Amino acid sequence: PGGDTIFGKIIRKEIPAKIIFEDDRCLAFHDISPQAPTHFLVIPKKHISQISVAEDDDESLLGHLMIVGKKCAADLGLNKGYRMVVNEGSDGGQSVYHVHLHVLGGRQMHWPPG
Amino acid sequence: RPGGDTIFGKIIRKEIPAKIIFEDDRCLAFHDISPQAPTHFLVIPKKHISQISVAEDDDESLLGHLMIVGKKCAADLGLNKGYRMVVNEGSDGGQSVYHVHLHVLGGRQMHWPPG
């Protein structure tokens, strides 16, 4: 395992998180520093440090994060829409080196996206 | 019609011009006409899916492929300091074209919140 980051600790259930959905290969949970009325993350259980090092073999898994994200969004009542975000590196503002998909909604999201 | 009715379908079929970065059997990457960062491009599926909220379970590989292509193009374009990937859904998400698309933005510091 899950990796040497705080998201690894969350996957291993070593520290608490408000879990929305789990399966054998990913976990969705509310972000601890929410930027919208609904703001959650979907992360793979496989430790991929960042999107730039993902491989072709990971394509199904990455797509799974997005499908889980959109299903969780529907379940959380985000019927007016939402925004998904993946941050990479310094310029991307990536805060934890474990791949994570942000899903934000419950308010108008603006442009540019940061 | 292959590619759908939106202006992204027109781009897929080469009916309107675009600044194409990458093309394969599943997707197309091209620069955004209204960039919000020094580098700002889109990766879209050739299969028309109107928005992420209606994607099917069987679309997983294709959606993941958009991200792999996004990160490969970012590398090929020299975005070594990082970048942000964005999918907009519906009104609150600020979606203006109803054909699924992955934004990739870089070349400057991106801020938080992401809009």
Curated annotation (Swiss-Prot), chain A:
Q: Name one GO biological process term.
A: purine ribonucleotide catabolic process
The reported effect of F21S is: Loss of SUMO-specific isopeptidase activity
Where it sits in the cell: the answer is: Cytoplasm; Nucleus
Location of the HIT domain: 6-114
Q: What broad taxonomic lineage does this protein's source fall under? A: Eukaryota, Metazoa, Chordata, Craniata, Vertebrata
Residues annotated with N6-acetyllysine modification: K9, K18
Positions carrying Phosphoserine are: S33, S60
Source organism, top-level taxon: Eukaryota
Task: Give the recorded effect for H39A.
Answer: No effect on affinity for 3-indolepropionic acyl-adenylate but a 13.8-fold increased affinity for tryptamine adenosine phosphoramidate monoester
Name it.
Adenosine 5'-monophosphoramidase HINT1
Q: Which residues form the active site?
A: H100
